[PDB]
Design a protein around this ligand. Sequence first.
Ligand SMILES: [Cl-]
Ligand SMILES: [Cl-]
Ligand SMILES: [Cl-]
Ligand SMILES: [Cl-]
Ligand SMILES: [Cl-]
Ligand SMILES: [Cl-]
Ligand SMILES: [Cl-]
Ligand code: NA
Length: 129
Amino acid sequence: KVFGRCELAAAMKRHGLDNYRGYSLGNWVCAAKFESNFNTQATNRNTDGSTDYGILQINSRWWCNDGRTPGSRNLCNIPCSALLSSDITASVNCAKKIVSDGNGMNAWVAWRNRCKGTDVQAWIRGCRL
Ligand SMILES: [Cl-]
Ligand SMILES: [Cl-]
Ligand SMILES: [Cl-]
Ligand SMILES: [Cl-]
Ligand SMILES: [Cl-]
Ligand SMILES: [Cl-]
Ligand SMILES: [Cl-]
Ligand code: NA
């Protein structure tokens, strides 16, 4: 599923991401924009052989099981395929664990490089929320 901007903001808010660990909704929308272009089915292979899955490009090295990432963990206790669903629940629940891991949203390199410090509220501007 490719979400619209405000549609994803609303779904993220419904699932409790707005101000989660102190990160406003616009931060989460911005991260999803640059990780996946709002596409739940996005996948990307990393150089190390792990793969990133879904709207927030969650990595198989630590967070989900895809059966093909040697030495990896599955700390969200989910198949990586669950991160590709039109229902964002699994991605949101796993993102909550990731953002709580110690480095906040810096875990998402694209957030650090493209969202951090910017006018992230622009991402939810106009949205009925
Ligand atoms: Cl957009
Ligand atoms: Cl915001
Ligand atoms: Cl594996
Ligand atoms: Cl594990
Ligand atoms: Cl599994
Ligand atoms: Cl959803
Ligand atoms: Cl933080
Ligand atoms: Na894994």
